[PDB]
From a paper:
The transcription factors p53, [name] and p73 play an important role in cancer prevention, development and longevity. Tetramers are formed via a short tetramerization domain that follows the DBD, with a short flexible linker region separating the two domains. Here, we report crystal structures of different [name] tetramerization domain variants, showing not only marked similarity to p73 but also small differences that may be important for regulating the function of [name] in vivo.
In addition, we also solved the structure of a variant lacking the C-terminal helix altogether, that is, containing only the structural elements of the canonical p53 tetramerization domain motif. Deletion of the H2 helix has been shown to substantially destabilize the [name] and p73 tetramers, and much higher protein concentrations were needed to shift the equilibrium toward tetrameric species. We solved the crystal structure of such a truncated variant of [name], [name](359–388), at a resolution of 1.9 Å. Interestingly, this crystal structure, solved in the space group P1, contained one tetramer in the asymmetric unit but with fundamentally different packing characteristics than those observed for the longer variant. The primary dimers are formed as observed for the longer variant, that is, by formation of an intermolecular β-sheet and antiparallel packing of the H1 helices. In addition, there are small differences in the structure of the primary dimers, most notably, a difference in packing angle and conformation of the H1 helix. This helix adopts an α-helical conformation throughout, whereas the packing interactions in the full-length variant cause a distortion at the C-terminal end of the helix and a transition to a 310-helical conformation. Key hydrophobic interactions at the center of the primary dimer interface are conserved. Hence, loss of the second helix in [name] and p73 not only weakens the tetramer but also fundamentally alters the overall orientation of the H1 helix packing, revealing a high degree of fluidity of this interface in the absence of the H2 helix.
Numbering used by the authors:
A (entry chain A): 360 to 388
B (entry chain C): 361 to 388
C (entry chain B): 361 to 387
D (entry chain D): 361 to 386
């Protein structure tokens, strides 16, 4: 199962979504 | 209130720290 | 301005991305 | 060693704490 991180607000959510993507790349490299 | 799906627990914890920081930036 | 010390290309580039989001939260 | 320019002490300190967590992680 995925983990589900609670977030308030679409602004913050979208930022974290983008950073997540970068972190996942980092962790694979 | 939204829920961001995350695969790794390491990613999850880092995102949790960044979220805390983003929340506090909203004060400035 | 302050100047954050960073060692390593990868870390610098990640912090640059996180910096952008931190700063945009104000707006 | 590189220096990332940042407007404002609060953002700078936030980024320092994040850097330590990032470095720990990787």
């Amino acid at each position: 199962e995925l983990l589900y991180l609670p977030v308030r607000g679409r602004e913050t959510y979208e930022m974290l979504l983008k950073i997540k993507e970068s972190l996942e790349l980092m962790q694979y490299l």
